[model samples]
Target chain A: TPSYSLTPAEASAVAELTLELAAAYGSFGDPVLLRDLPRLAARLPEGVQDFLREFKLADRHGHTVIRGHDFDQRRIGPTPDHWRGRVRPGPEFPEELLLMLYSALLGEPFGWATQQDGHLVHDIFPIRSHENDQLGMGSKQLLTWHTEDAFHPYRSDYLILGALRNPDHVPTTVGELDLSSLSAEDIDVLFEPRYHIAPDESMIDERPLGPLLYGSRLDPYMRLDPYFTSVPQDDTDARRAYDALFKVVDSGMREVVADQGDVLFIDNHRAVHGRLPFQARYDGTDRWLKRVCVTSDLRRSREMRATSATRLLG
Target chain B: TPSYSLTPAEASAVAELTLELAAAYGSFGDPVLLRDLPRLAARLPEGVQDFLREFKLADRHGHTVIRGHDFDQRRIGPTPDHWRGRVRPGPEFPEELLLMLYSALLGEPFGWATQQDGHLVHDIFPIRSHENDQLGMGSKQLLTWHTEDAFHPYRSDYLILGALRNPDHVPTTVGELDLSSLSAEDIDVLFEPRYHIAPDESHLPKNNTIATEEEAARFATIQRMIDERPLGPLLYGSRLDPYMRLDPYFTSVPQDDTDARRAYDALFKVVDSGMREVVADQGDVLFIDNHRAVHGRLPFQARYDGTDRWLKRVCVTSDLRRSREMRATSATRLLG
Candidate 1:
């Protein structure tokens, strides 16, 4: 979990500095942005610097939400109906640049080959055609909690979301079980590699099987998707343990209603996130957010990447 | 096991056609061999074509060994001291191309990412460092019988081996259980998905730390496959003659289940009693049904005098779509 935050004045100063950098470069998503992040970050406010440093050292809460940033709703057009041509940096370029800058402080950014045609900056907005769908763009059904890309070993270490507008205060859900909550017997069964976390529908192939949990039992890493994970039909013990985990995670959830200027970063390894169902307004002014994925080490996935210059994973 | 002998005239014709094909191609390891196998096979003798067709339609014996094929040992050079640059076809190009042409009749051919540097045609020759190792390259110790690549669901359906040189007349070992040998109750216990089969050491990365995270994940998947019980039964299809998936060197039964233990021991005994030995001489090709049988080799002394035993091997999958993601193109059969 994120352990610190920036004050209103510091947040304003950081946004201004990000805009200045964007103006000088005159564009976003360039390789130069990654190269110049360290220097650009040094010019940010002290509070912002402290938060980034402490977050890197030790994360306590699995997430951090920055408040009191700025967004001009009138200048930016209505929420995009579809993600075809509107996925690029638009009138919301300043805010998107801010998110990209903060993302660089954590690690390199990447895109999935199967999702949004491999766009680095993803747009999350409601679509009327997919109103009742189970996807992230769906506005009716709850987006069940899950660790992002839990089936892939190279899944991001952090998932960052910057809210452009949230008129009805639709809440984003997060959950993580305390290590001390499980009994000795439960931990043993949970760590036995008995669960099969299938790939989400977005990835169009049947991938290899994987364990639900790995690493140290005392300080474990989780790989679970409520919509995709399951236990073998014959393993009674695994089925019981899986059900118990779901109950515990469901009860531990905390909701945060992100408003304009709010930036949320969730630790992908330590926590799972979802969204509460909300009513959709087909009109142009629906809830909209920009999302990005960050990984601590990019070289680890060299083989999967098409090239060093591109962050697209195959 | 089934055995067939080529007539003197048929054997001569096959040798002539294979040599002509080899001369036309002029090089071994050229991708053209895989693409032109069907045409090359069409030129083979009618007897050989009929035998291959019947074998594919119904493989009742689980293995077939072709005899009486001709080889000129004088033209083929001595076995190399090591299996580095010398593993490719030399004067044995005719024999190697014949094996490739025959393998195309079974299914598409593929090589494992972790074995023999992913060569479609692998050379099995004795290596000094692996004299007592458990791999096929080892000669001092018996290679235990097991299904090839049994840890993955995409394992080969047929394993083809063509002997280029075997001066010692060493026998390759094979085993398959007689379904009637076990009691109904024991068969039920054996069919349950309660067993674990670890990946062979050859599949492990050469250096753990040097491996990328993606490679680590693949290894992790292999480990998880072993630890978790499979959803499907080890034996499937008709109960009278069910297909078997077993590995004597790397299989484990359910803990504390007496019935499972008894069934597991019974399988070992049955396989041992039913085991058959097939001696593959020069120019002989042997096909083992990987789904219905397990194979190994008898321990023999390594002469190290460049006259030791050597065999050319290839793996075939009935359905190529099983590994479509790993392949670079439809024509590419090497998997990673």
Candidate 2:
């Protein structure tokens, strides 16, 4: 597992670029800045760009760790009680900008029309009202493992999670398919279209019918949500297959180790992800994680978008 | 397969109910009436209701034809050279009501937030501007087979196409998968998520003369959709019969996946060979299972003048609640 730590030269370029862009555009939410993100991303030092490009070309374990960015622990301000449009972006704005820049190198960064009201960058932090929910904003509860937006046809291809603060050591979780446990018959049934999974409409939408396991058999890709799935009754075979499938999933995940200035890139489809629960003091010292969803092919979601340039899927 | 027509008694009930509805709601475009469509559909004579109910259970061939309704051809006036909101409800309003009444029995009626200005009932007629286009309003060009809104995740479960006028006997075409043509292995490749399908031109912004600072954002999103499309399976559901979601004009496989490419090629042939035409004359309504079959029209020179073929169409979904995220509200049929 090779992790990239920006050299001083690369690190300064990102700092100067983010500062310049932030001043050029009043808010990080500026659409003009958004439309030109890939171009701005080109300003990233060539060494780091090579790493991102090579990482995509050589498929490996689903996680990549990038370290060495700096944030003003004091100037970044205390974590907010909510993610209301990141309205008062503190000095940490450059950190948010850098995440998208690095992310732009790999794929398109998008927001949900239904999520954070379509902001390209998301402030994923706990809010008191969401304490009892299963959403990213949920707190004091297990967020539950899921392929991000798992039930939708246009779910993200990759998820980028960067920690703005980790005073609480609340590590996010992920697990890939631990393939060996299922028998040949089980694999066949899991891939057949007999499964039923619906989006949590309290949060999102749709009932997509698909197999739990699909794509390549040798090194497969998957979509799963232990909580959202409801298989048909009276099918003993399906029940057993689903139960067996859960075992491998439970066995595969481990926290990827987090740090305040570090970012974690996850293959949204190849692994199931969620967060571990921690008590929230809301002392402005709560853990703050910056989140963004990226798609290798944003084109696939064009129909859901309202226009050719926006990334917010309806 | 409601190849079953309305029995005379049922036909009389429909005529009485439609006239009753037209009186209660001055316009067929009333949101109140659209909401009550399914409930009003309950007024369908029990025999007819039972027949329609059983048809869904049977899941036979994709096409379901309902006949035995009457239209006042002369009072209905000529097919307009346009479909501006079905702006004025004429005698054909009963035909429009009947289509929705029957449509409600199958599923919830919906309109495109972008298409037809969010009207639940759409008037499909050839406007001179659309003669060479590939949309429902297209003429002088093959309407080319497609699973309606083939690129949308919330594409309709069923499409209700009701003929308001077809003096020329223009035939609508349909094709189903000929299962035997492809080997079992070929079906497997199709089931895999290796295929790419983009939104058709009918959905592009150039096709829409139109949006707000609010809508302009959405309009920009529409432009993105035109250029940035995505991938999905060509077929899915029960492996035995399988349901398909594809429009070859906008579908293709990865650059070198010969396995998927060959399978896609085979499907093109199967669809072509199975193509058949059905002429829906005045008052005949055709319901198509969007997932199970692709439907289109045979080209004919559309007289830009009045008196051309026209259809009052509506899109339906089995579970309207499944798309609540896109709808502005639970009550809004438009996927805003």
Candidate 3:
């Protein structure tokens, strides 16, 4: 049922990047940056590292943006006491974190919000025999294809995974639906923007408004949540659009396989990522990976994080 | 619908123990016994802590068991070279690095390898939410009913959970399967050991051998993995056992609210212990009477950061209660 495939060369490159990212981002401790900050700074370009040291990453100036607030924020670090009741930098701000900042601002005409620039980073171990049933039948079975941060109203622009371990002999697959890959007709349909995307499952309590996509033809932002998206209450046009979006997502894309030491950079707006069937070996050394995200601009959500930087959007 | 309930008295006692356990086991940096070890030992008729420090819980004999391993094993003053490799006694050990040890050993007589003196300690934390949705629906939701370490070939004779945080409004539920609570016919049916309890979704890779019927029957080893018990493989007979070993979280049995509550309470009693649904607020902590309970959580929305419902979970086995091999070495490392 899956229609995505990739060249061997692409797979290799992804694997290499995965390792680099893993080493850089997988080194956080319980106290996070307090322990891994210096080491992480060592990985960044000298200039960027210096920039980080001089400036603050917190919301003091109402300039920072945060994505994946549901889970990513908690895993990083509790705001430390010294910064408590103050507009100072966060304790765990490390240099490697710049990669996240850079990616978010890569091609933006101006700047994107910091809220769109972050994601949850946790360790996912490989499948061993003992955990195969649990991992297989539970949620990480490698069969389902779904979007990450589907539960958040404001999701990240990217979902980057750094592979630390992969034992299932199967590659974690990522499928992309970027504009470059679409046909003219597909673009027209997508541009029409009638499609609805679901909210992440965790957002079951706070039911979202109807199908994500709205607005006129020219300027469009997608609300593509695969698992929970639904059609508008009674609009046939919206239902048709929703059906088409699923058809495209389910069929139109390329595969991005992540191997050991590989870092996967997924354009969340333009793609969907999921895994194929695999085993779980909960023997403490299962398939492990580190994940983070970035949004190219920070001006979008100035109100959300109003403490660190002073950049304002027009 | 769910069929479990707990009394206020039971909940209070468990909550108290949970706090005590957290205070005793929460120090992730300093040695757990630095101060309290002497004080707790002083209360004992015999200077238990002194004897332990001098005899059982002393030295760094890790090289003997874990030599040639890649992780650094030695300490250079206060610094742990391999933060991941630092070996602490298993939770069930007499003097465990974490407080879960004493409770697990004293809790049940059958569960995991830890209860069988397995030397391995468990590590569960905020950083390790169950993200494998397809694998076990772990991390997808607050896991409901289920036993801990159920998949290991060596399950804990007892399992212990130390709550580092509980912010959710409910207590972590622990439902037991009461043999007495069941009808005589149901009890007789379950007594046949026909059900095949699967491994914890995360631990499925460590075991592969499917037990035969004969293997199932004689699996009376009280302390082996629940799945390893000898249950004869019968295509249809196996179907009948569903009533006996349903996943507590998923199973629905009985109709009366009072009966359901009683059944739930009885199961809790049978299981040894269970955690009440709890939302561990900052500074809220708990330790399960592992022998008296099986524990599970009601899902909470993650406010992810350093503080998302953080619980430093550790497992301990009691099989090594007083082993000569462990005693001789002084510094003990457990079997995983």
Candidate 4:
């Protein structure tokens, strides 16, 4: 329920600030820009700040979509052929910085050291090698619904997906739990830290034990990964709760088509996301999304890295 | 209930690492150690690690008390008459570093730019001149229970109180809400963004040791924050067991907001009823969940005669990125 589209005036202001920051600092990954992001983000139009504030605080059933802000897709260039997305900042810097500024309000934009060589903003597009794998790069197989990096302790609080191009309108499926149908005992079992969530193929972890349902009851927050989450063999109570939640998620799944200039923020703690099986176009103009992960507490990842300034989660 | 006493083996291992870290870094604030604290802390005795894991995960009403550990009182020297007198928190003192080590496991240790010369680990003790003030330095007047830096948006998630020398046994007051007694409507009102809390005197430039132009500028920002205090809720998080964020000495609600005023009153009453006293002795580290509870101190007569209740304090934030805007850089722990 919490969503907004930028006014034309707000859009122009964002454009002006993007050029200003880009001119001041050549690359968005510059340590100077990263350090001063909070100060720079404060200068964003009040329209943006207020919307993001509500987006973070308010209860919502689906991914927060910000629309009506258009970008020059021609300048963004055609999608790459493979998953070896190298870093050379240009053409998409405007939209990239725009997304980064917007994402900065929620939390610090970070990346995985193991994924994409620790690039802050990840390029998510179909690749030939990963066609059948359960990953963002997969094109043929249905990417199973799960929390991104479900096994990592310092996983992103918000998963930002900004569409650079989606000509086919390929759908990104999102899962929202319906707890109204659950019994008190079901909730009690789900809240216990007995269930184990294994790491995704994209990254790594040590099979951490945690509760799927946490946070508040009014706005119940759940971190689930049907593809990776598992319960003990003898734990029938946990199995029942898991089955009930999986049913609810299956029935309530959302198919969102992020178009050009649309930025979607999925509450990683509250919702699980995946993508439908789609045939690869192999052409340069296929679906291209700029994905960035935002952590509520970057300090939690301090041990994963030697330097505090770097936002990559090792 | 999530309390633990260090086993002899655990204490021995802690002492060895404390000496090893001191030899390597020389100061707890060394960039190398601050950057490496978590990794080193992970290597802590399994006993300590097991205790910390439970302390962090489990929910409890009172502070997590880890007892059965002691340091050499003579080597640490006598309690100072004032903060300016003698001791400065450094690697030479293993207790503060030890506190920093254990605290790092829970979260990153940070400080206020406008307080304690921006030192991450702060020294808390009574000064004769600060006897009547409401700040931590005060001794004569009861330091009212408060969420540390409750006025600030990025206040500590947990407040760490480690006693270096508290020979007087002056009790530290704590406030944990009694949710069983609170009416549903009362919690609803307190949860609304309707109350205002002004910056505490501890953040005042007058109380700071270093008052340079740069320091004055941060103070100006603090002053600006004080002048334009915004409305925020006294409670956040789960409705069933909400976290308390209030400084009774500086909190206020709109006069006409009758429902909120009543809720505020009810909150204080419950906090008063459940409020407990914890008198930490030397080597005892008390970690209070700053969000779920508030803490302060009871008034005590100070002997300013080279002996007083000297406790080293540090603040931990589960989400330091929340304060990224306030800090100069990610490495900088102080929030302006």
Candidate 5:
């Protein structure tokens, strides 16, 4: 994977730029901020810009992890349980602005009406009552490997997670299909659209069956969710192929430890992501990660969009 | 609604019998309790049995509320924060066992593998974080009325809810379509299968992967079951007194189908105008006709002070054979 740690001077410059943008754009939830993110992306440090450019230009790693950014723990305040009742332009405004700028490098930032109260930026922290939940906020449960919104045709191309705090050193898991380990027969069956990927709990609507693997066979795109996707019952070959594919993906899994000021973006088509289960104290300090989705072309999801001006999809 | 208040003698007898059954069964989580519940139903008081039979034959009110049954709140203890990791046969065992027996009178009791950890008996209590959720357990948000498991073909015909405690006296809402209120054109449009009903959140798996062969099989079965079921009209059966299966939160018509959208809007308006509210007291059991009406709950602030509302719930199917493949065995009521 492409990775970089910003130099001290570069980190300071980016922080100052983000703060300036925060002042210019008053509310982090404003749609205008999302539209202006591309302009702000032009102001990023030279090395950071180079890395994003290289990653976009056919880099095989399928993701980029940026580190050494600035984040003031005390200034951000305690993580909230939900977005409701929060004051606008709160302490986390700079962090949100920075995340949008980075995400704009990949595509347009969007939200889902059914998830996180449809906020442009989502807050991921362990909630006391949701410790055993299946959602991103759950602590004890493994987040599970998945292609973000795999059931939807217009899912984001890049899924971004920005770490504000991770005192426990919890690792986000990633997996990709290793072609060398699979037989030609396996590849042939896997390429067929005989799979049904159900919508995750995060979505309020159910979706129809769709292909698991798409695009070119040489460099295939995946929309798999081991948790919610399944092969057709009557198709024995498809079932076996699915099982074989899962094994290759599992054996090739890697863990990425995300710390404070780290931004990780996974190519939704090339790799799937999950999180290791960790104990949550619920005592003010816990892992708090900010998340947002980015699409290469928002027009693909025009039918699902709430309106022309809004980037929220149901 | 047709309701009955238990006589003092009847209440005492039923309570004592239920306590004995709980002692013998040991735990409400026992599989044997679910298998033997029908046998126990036969032992209920003759008056109660007769009332159930008559109600099942021809329900006049779409529901029946039985009150004045004995329940000791002090012994039942405080409400639980969540449904995970508590003693199986804890303080509410007697009440749960009684609820199951009553449910057996209406039909065979069953549970969904995805909800409440697949327990044949489910707990209905408010959790702090889910207070504003769109799910049934949400407290602060008004739950939209709908038939239980309207997305599945093997959905329960009757939903039974038994109240253990309710300090705030929050009401459970019910609604029935007044067919006379809708125009013939609207009714014709509604009869067409142009709407989709999504599965509720309770059925979602927590983990990202199935993790085992058995779980994978169950996942495939669930997925196929949801996909195979066809969507149809919101109202059906007798033209004079139509049945309903509506979930305002989950059901949606095609954006391009103007007729379907108009029919949906009109039905919603009529259902809202026809809604009735009922508050269940401690030891009161409310049986709702799932096909004839939709049921929901009014929004209320949860105290979370151990005295919050709590209820025991069970689903009953008139034709158990419809889900024969999903169950573990012929006698088991738990379905995957």
Candidate 6:
């Protein structure tokens, strides 16, 4: 278990290069830049690949959890920035990687960029303070754990947090109950695998089951975010799943304080991420971090990267 | 005819300033500093007014295209870069008259600050070069001569193109059949205005031309690329009455370029504009001076800018969305 921790150089390298590349990618929208991404992905180290595969699938129903089957093989955008112009089959890897990762980790890609001045690159700023009443807005509330955007059709597979600054003594906790960590009966409930989860009311529109994700055992990813996700309107199995999932999430609130340059990657498909409330000084600095979501293999065929714009997970 | 061309300062002011302002608006979404765009519009010198109005309504279709119509006015961002999100509404006659002048000319508000960073701003470059195929992407390819995106419900009241560099000596020309400039007979053809132009295929799917009332309206805005458009699309006709609408080529090509794969080029000779095309070695900036001019590039060497001689593009819409119809399009239909 200890061996999983990344070295400072490894982590820093990922952070620096990712930031630089994202900046360049954000500048241009040329198709050439997008076409060259897979080549860059080929250059990633084995360690990074291993890390990517860890959280590949995310559960779409109750308490959205991430499943890390091919955890370290996920690829991200051609550049740190990409326009979700059209959903087509081009590069199979890059698009899928970005979609899932962004869903679990970042809020809407467009929304995140505009609000944070691109400084807060990724969107996973759990328990951060804000006065807006919009979902995930306002600092005083206790946000329950669930798949970040279980309601969206293209939910994220993983949630990545790149800490820019963390001033609160409070730890942004991460709870983990690896399937291996569960008892036989609980594992059965966890693996029942066929449960319905409700969608966040705020996210509900004309869509039913709020964009359901049907998964088989081969691609079992946890999808849970209590606040943003729920059981179906009348489905009991989904209710059972939600109750159990919430219990487990509450039991696993292990506090973690991430510092500047510290990145905390969460398996949005395998695990649920939430924050422990802390004092808000109303100061400009309060647990500032960038969040980016990525799906490892969503759209690898749409190999869009002109140069170093895109990177491969595996 | 030669006297209409812009001098160095005017060109630099438009090109460099437009580029910087585009960057700022892309990052900032909309600038707050130039909120009172009309005030600025009123301040323009007489000669510039025609240019300003040309940009304000060229290819106008029927609605005003201005910026700073939505969110409350504000500075661009914390960044120190020139634009860095600082957008001034064109009507306000901004203190920085250059940006105001350019924004008015574009008809759309200046953008760049909201999205940030600068690259070939818009993605419209020829991928296949003449060398690749002798029939070279025929220059007279019979490309449709509709306004850039007139079919979309929320089409650009005006479109602006800022040429950062031009390497090919081939001229970037456009065929403008402005109602005012047209023969009285041609003007009559446009007045019958109900011609059915097909929607750009790329935007067709999102159009949802078959959706229900509200859904259809929502889809229309998306199709128009005016999900953020401040003015409404239905009014495009009325706006075109007073201003010369900028459409691509007016009629089908009289003769196709001999090169099979070359792009069919249209020259904007009798048209009005603030910029020129690549006449010599192409490196100097060429502002499509969008508002007053309907422009298109003549097929030239893509090898110059290293990758398809790129141009930076930024779009701004006048505050036409401020009108009742536009407000109805908002997610929160306060007006409806």
Q: Tell me the spans in candidate 4 whose CA falls farther than 4 Å from its real position.
A: A1-314, B59-62, B85-92, B201-229
User: How does model 6 fare in lDDT?
Assistant: 0.37
Model 1 earns a TM-score of 0.51
Which is the leading candidate under lDDT?
Answer: 5
**Each candidate's chain A: what TM-score?**
0.91, 0.91, 0.51, 0.93, 0.94, 0.56
DockQ (0 to 1) for model 6: 0.01
Q: Is the docking of candidate 2 incorrect, acceptable, medium or high quality?
A: incorrect
lDDT of 1 by residue, B1-336 (tens): 567798889889988998898788856467655555644565677567667755654545678988888877777778777766764457877877777777766666778765676777788889888897877788999887887877666678888898888988888888887988888988887777666666666554442334554444434444555466554455653455667788867776767867777888888888888888888888788999887888999999998888989898988875443344334333456555
- Top TM-score: which candidate number? 4
DockQ score for model 5, please?
Answer: 0.01
lDDT of 6 by residue, B4-106 (tens): 2455544444444434444454232233323323223333333444544432223322222121111111331111122234344322121133434444433
Structure candidate 5, residue pairs in collision:
A227-B208
- Assess each model's interface with DockQ, reporting 2 decimals per model: 0.01, 0.01, 0.01, 0.05, 0.01, 0.01
Q: All predictions: root-mean-square deviation over Cα?
A: 18.3, 21.9, 25.9, 19.6, 27.1, 21.5
Give model 3's docking category: incorrect
Question: Model 3, B265-313: lDDT tens per residue?
Answer: 4544554442344443322224332222355665545444433443333
Interface RMSD of each: 25.3, 23.4, 27.6, 16.6, 29.6, 23.9
Compose the digit string of candidate 1's lDDT tens values, residues A1-314: 44345576776787678667767775555655655553455466656655664553343456877767767777667887898766465777777777777776666677787688687778888988767888888786564888998877778888989999998989999887676766666766886768777766672235555666554454555777877787779999888877877787778889977787788888787788999998878788888998989876453454466554557788
What is candidate 6's TM-score against the reference? 0.33
Model 1 iRMS (Å) reads 25.3
lDDT string, candidate 5, A20-123, tens digits: 88788878566556545554576787568657745643425656799998888878888776566666667888898888887766666888887867878888
| Residue B205 lDDT (model 1) | 41
Query: Which regions of candidate 6 deviate over 4 angstroms?
Result: A1-38, A41-120, A123-129, A132-138, A176-207, A210-220, A228-241, A297-314, B1-336
Report the Cα lDDT for residue B108, model 3: 13
